[PDB]
Amino acid sequence: AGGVGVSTGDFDNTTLWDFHEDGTATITCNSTRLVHLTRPDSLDYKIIPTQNNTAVQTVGHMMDDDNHTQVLTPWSLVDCNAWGVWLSPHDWQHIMNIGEELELLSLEQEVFNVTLKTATETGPPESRITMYNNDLTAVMMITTDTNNQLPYTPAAIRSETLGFYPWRPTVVPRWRYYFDWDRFLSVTSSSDQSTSIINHSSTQSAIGQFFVIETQLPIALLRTGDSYATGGYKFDCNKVNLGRHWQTTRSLGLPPKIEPPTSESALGTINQNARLAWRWGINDVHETNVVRPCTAGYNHPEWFYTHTLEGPAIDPAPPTSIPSNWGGGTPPDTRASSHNQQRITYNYNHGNKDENLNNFSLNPNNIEGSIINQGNFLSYEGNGQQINTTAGVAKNGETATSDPNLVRYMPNTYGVYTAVDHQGPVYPHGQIWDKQIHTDKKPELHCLAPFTCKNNPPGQMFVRIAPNLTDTFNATPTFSEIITYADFWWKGTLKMKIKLRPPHQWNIATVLGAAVNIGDAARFVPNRLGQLEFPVINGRIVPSTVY
Amino acid sequence: AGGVGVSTGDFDNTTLWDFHEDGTATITCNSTRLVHLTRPDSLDYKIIPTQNNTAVQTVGHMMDDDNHTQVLTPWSLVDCNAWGVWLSPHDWQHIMNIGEELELLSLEQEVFNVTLKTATETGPPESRITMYNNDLTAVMMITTDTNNQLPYTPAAIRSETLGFYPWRPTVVPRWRYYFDWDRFLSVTSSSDQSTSIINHSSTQSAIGQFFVIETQLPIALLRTGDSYATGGYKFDCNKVNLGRHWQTTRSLGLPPKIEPPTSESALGTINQNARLAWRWGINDVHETNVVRPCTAGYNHPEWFYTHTLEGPAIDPAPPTSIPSNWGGGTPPDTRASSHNQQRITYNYNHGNKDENLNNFSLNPNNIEGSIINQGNFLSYEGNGQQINTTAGVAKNGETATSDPNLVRYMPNTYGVYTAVDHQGPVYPHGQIWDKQIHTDKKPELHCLAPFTCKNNPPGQMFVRIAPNLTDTFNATPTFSEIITYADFWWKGTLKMKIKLRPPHQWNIATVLGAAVNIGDAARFVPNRLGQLEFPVINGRIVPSTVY
Amino acid sequence: AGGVGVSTGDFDNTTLWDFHEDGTATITCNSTRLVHLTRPDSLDYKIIPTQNNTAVQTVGHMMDDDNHTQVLTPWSLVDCNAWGVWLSPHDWQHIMNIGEELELLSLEQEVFNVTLKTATETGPPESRITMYNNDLTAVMMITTDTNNQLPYTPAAIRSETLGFYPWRPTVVPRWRYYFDWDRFLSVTSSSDQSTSIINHSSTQSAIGQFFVIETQLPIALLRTGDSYATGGYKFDCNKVNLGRHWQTTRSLGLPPKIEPPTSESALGTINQNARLAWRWGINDVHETNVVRPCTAGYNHPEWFYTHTLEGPAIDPAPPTSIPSNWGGGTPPDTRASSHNQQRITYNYNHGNKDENLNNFSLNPNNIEGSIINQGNFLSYEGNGQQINTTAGVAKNGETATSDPNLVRYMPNTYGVYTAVDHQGPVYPHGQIWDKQIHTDKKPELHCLAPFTCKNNPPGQMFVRIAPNLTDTFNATPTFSEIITYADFWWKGTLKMKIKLRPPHQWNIATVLGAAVNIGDAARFVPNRLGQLEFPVINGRIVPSTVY
């Protein structure tokens, strides 16, 4: 509640830890940034189809298809769904190291200190200078979508979120959403000809839904002395496990009875006739046969692109760990990308060191569901006889080297016994929460965000600069204006609950330290010139038993 | 409560709409028909095996196998589970147009005005005439199965339901159920020989269960003045979504940052280095790569017949939309039936125009889970390099044209990220509700009925004519009788709740109108001669956002 | 209640639907726009006569007479009486599709965020630049006319209403009213000479009434922090029927007794001696003779221009449907405009696609009162004898081809038995309400607006910019000023009640859909370049029985 020269709101980027008697803590992490808003290019909405030329015009690249249809709005999106907005590299270490599981509690946010200004270039065409002046009666438009009537676009994907540096100002993107279209692109190989390609794209204007912010939801017109607050929100969603499960399918159970070695250089051995009980098939009991409570993880066709009614698209399995340094004894033959891995491309605003673009490919440390793909093999019989993959009188199976398509590349072993893990949070760039799709069958996991809202997610927040007109305006498709921009302050608070992990074991545990695992430590702190980069860190570190 | 000349019950086929303050309505739709019952052929039960000759005796047709074992009862089934029993073409339009979701509430039914009669042919063998007389002390037998001890046979499949014309009388079928058998039929191609076929069918009389209506459940003997009522029933089941989701996997999310076109004939373009954040694999961010909340729909082996311990049978995926008119730019190569489609064969009683048989193949308008099958392709690496399908030093994947069996015909991409939709109600012929199978793992959807009873479904209802004997009866396997038939009135009431869809968008929505979409409008209304046909209409029409 | 940097009021363009237990709903549709006001040209009032030259100076065109007298005020009119201000194309569809009748409830409106500014051109005459600055102590003048002392000018005619685009700013016109004059223009044909024309126009300054806003009604002087509100208003007027009556005079009643056809290609026939009862005149009973409850619609002289004491003017009958595509079998001979039709000319502000002007001629779908004019004929006797139109011993009548003037062009059949319908609402351009003329005999309908206020209508609203003076002012007829303009926000809320139509019939009804009836669907949604047009739609669509 202030005027021209009275400020609203304050800057709090701190974090807090409130411990409780029952062995849990509450983490209050609040964040505040200065945002730079700029006027839209056109007053109205646009439905514009787009495509990538090199994908449709060359035979082999159908995986490059960008062809779609979207609608631009004269509105900008204020989104903080990434981790790196809320908490620092030290906060991440501290949560992962002592944490067992965490859950979301509440979210609230507001804007204040709006301060619009105008820019006017003057002088001769040789020396042109712009002057800046507060326009005190100018208005900025702001609204939040509650009841979630608009399409839901998370901005953590595509890296549009508020910036990660607490001491720098930030930019917002312009909001947009898809509009219905039809697409078909034929499959072609490095053989044949480009005149054989058929691409079909048509925007469907009868079926599509066209939303406008103005008629959907109410808007607050706010001048310099005004502020806007959402009022508070309460999450309802699943808890997230912070421990890494080292166990695989093969490590679940009671291990067999063995004879211990007498010498330090020696191996244990399993005596024949010490092999007893349950297994799958007809064979002696071996570590491969043993009946176990469930299978961990599953095979999935990779990488397999599915052609929807609009465009090709990819069907992933959850991401899993890739063996990194196995001292020679590696999987000899591996592909460019192996276990469902994910990459991110980000820029300076999101924690790159400089104005260039940076790329990072994630390798999770989750060991459980991971499948070395070259070692799969099929056996027509369980009998435990030597495998013969040559075509003839004795053909008892096939191996991933024999028919790679059938075994290595396109198995699907999903079934009733399978159990999988979400790859967990990813810092700074990961998405915190996501709404659930509205369908008869729901998914069992989401591809990125660890949290899934059971009820409606927190509503999306939009801003724009109201038009500022000269004296000659007649209502016409095009008209002169006054160049105007706004800089406002954003503040938000996210509350989470964490339970503390008690010491579970005798030997010393592996935690998240400095100078080796993450990298050179000097690379994450400021420079002589003031430069640093945000460490890209994995969500789960301290091991735990899954069964 | 009436005698010989006092009627019981009344005719109400009307529908009602009761609106509520909270934006929902109650739909009371009740239906009444005159049913013609005829005496059974044999007094007793029969366990009769059957087969189709042309399937076992020719090499290539194993998909024609009709071979099974059933038991005939001297009882008829009164079933109204189809939509077309309850409500008119205008009621269907009105529900779909303004409706958002609907749920079932209650069901009740009764029979009245029983009126049995006898028929006796007399006269010379040249001119033979039959006379008709009320037999006032004759009895009709009626019972309903509550507690659901008998096998559950829905009659909407096989088209045995009460007729769809409000102004015509109806027929009931004779009730029957399966009895255990063993079956094996070997697979043979258009090559080789018919002496190579081996068909095995044996009814198993030790294991099978044999039910008789008389000893399972109590029966009401009712004369002309008598009536019978079930007493009312209350559904517990899932709600059904009435909107069509236009979105696919590829339309879910925030669309990319693009450069808008300057000209009306022009396309948007995605600038390099404007490509940021999350995706699957190692490549630049493209519409195919982008990480999305979930995958919509899944690949499934089609059409794949599985051989159970009795007979072959087919494993479907849910039905989805087939691209119809795409202006040339179609999927070039498509099969006789493509996306899990379903057909129905029906007759005059169920809304055909005349005494012939009619066939209709359903095409749903649900766009979401549909998969154009010819566009699938596999990539051994995510690197985004040109695809090479020729065998040699560089083989980076395969396409649906390269190995159609592996890619097009027999993929299974089901997994943790998948989400699907039920194809929704179908009018007039669709099944309204279904009981759930009693198993450790339940299904996630049912193949036809939109509603799944959590508790026991409404009990099935049976009728028969009691035997009417001449004077010479001694208890013997075969005996003379008096020819007798009954005509009774059936009445039922189904209550449903619907929530009203508020206007969600700016542009004009697509609703269900006349004269174009359905067809010629003159074809659905009576003729000079009194003839009409029931429009076959899809359940969901007004689009909505799934995410 | 705010100052320089404190905003007043908020932006709400949303619509709402509140359903009720009795089967009606309340529609709250509120609208908000940014208005650009500019300073008047002259401080004072003007009484200026005008004329069109080409009408008085050429023989044949007396229908082009523009000659009148008006008075300009230094005031602008803020009017929202058009439909297209309040609600979107989807709202229109939704009301017409499920609505039966609607009535008006209340109206309220206010202005806020006034922000005046000044413009000053500076620099050399080669490069002249204007600068813009807030003048914080400047005042805008605003008043509303309650008690309705001023002449009532609806602005929906002449297309002066606030614009139809929710996301664009708007312009207001300058208010003006008629001042008494005398006019006579002689009738002349394409024959004779222009020296025979006599035009007489004299403004009458003794009789005429001269109103000034300043002395009639009080005015509020408001600066930037000020706002103005009218306080609310309550309609009292007639209800409006939303259904289209398909029936004509000839379809009202019990149809005759006929013999049905045996064949599908065949026609029913009316047996002689099956013709019984009431009719008009002496003849057998035919569909033309039958006594009916009333006559629907009436003949009227068209097009007939009446010369008032000032100028010629036209006497319309209500507009009715024109047969469009009748497959050949059309009315062979039709005029440029046939059944009392109406056109509208509108510009970009009111929903044209671009800066050009657009024209649309309305064809109502109301079938009832429409009269095909070429088929009228007169019979001197009712006897049913063959009509003879040749002059001689047997002349029993005349036909529209025989004497078109007497029969086709100048009949008036209005009388005691006649019944007519208003053509209903028209979107976006139609007028919502109108005040009733103050006379001994009132009209039975109004030409455009569906609603007629019984009490006083809502008062008209006026704005102007107060004069902003330089330092040299002495009171003189002409003086220097400071160039000043204002941009204010307008907000209003209109409440309506609608009753919901229950399903009335068996066959599928015709509703308002997309892609065919209205036109190309892509034409009503934004473009690649952001362009769209407002569909011009008719008020009544779902048929209903008038009797």
Numbering used by the authors:
A (entry chain G), B (entry chain A), C (entry chain F): 19 to 565
What are the paper's exact sentences on this?
The capsid also protects the genome enroute to the nucleus for uncoating and replication. This study determines the capsid structures of TuV and CuV using cryo-electron microscopy and image reconstruction (cryo-EM) at ~2.9 Å resolution and compares them to the recently determined structure of BuV and other protoparvoviruses toward functional annotation. The VP ORF encodes two overlapping structural proteins, VP1 and VP2, sixty copies of which assemble the T = 1 icosahedral capsid in an approximate 1:10 ratio, respectively. The individual VPs contain an eight-stranded (βB to βI) anti-parallel β-barrel motif, with the βBIDG sheet forming the interior surface of the capsid. The virus capsid plays a central role in the infection by the protoparvoviruses as it mediates the attachment of the virus to specific receptors on target cells.
Similarly, in 2014, TuV was detected in feces of a Tunisian child with unexplained diarrhea and TuV IgG in one child and one adult from Finland. However, one exception was the diffuse electron density observed for amino acids 533–534 exclusively in the TuV map located near the 2-fold depression where only weak density was present for the main chain at a sigma (σ) threshold of one preventing reliable placement of amino acid side chains. The less ordered state in this region of the TuV map could be the result of the presence of multiple smaller amino acids 531-GAAV-534 conferring flexibility to this loop. TuV exhibits the most extended 5-fold channel among the known capsid structures of all members of the Parvovirinae with a radial distance of ~135 Å from the center of the capsid. The extended channel in TuV is not the result of amino acid insertions in the loop, but is instead caused by a different structural configuration of the DE loops which runs more radially upright from the capsid surface, compared to MVMp where the apex of the loop is tilted. While clearly separated in the CuV capsid and completely merged into a single “spinwheel” in MVMp, the 3-fold protrusions in the TuV capsid displayed an intermediate phenotype, with the protrusion almost fused at the 3-fold axis. The intermediate phenotype seen in the TuV capsid is due to this loop being truncated by 6 amino acids compared to MVMp and adopting an alternate conformation. In TuV, both VR1 and VR3 display less variability to MVMp (local RMSD 1.6 – 2.2 Å) with no insertion or deletion in VR1 and a single amino acid deletion in VR3. The readouts from these arrays showed approximately the same average signal fluorescent intensity for both viruses with strong signals over background for TuV and weaker signals for CuV (~5-fold over background with large error bars). In the TuV array the 17 top glycan binders all represent SIA containing carbohydrates (14 highest are shown in Figure 6).
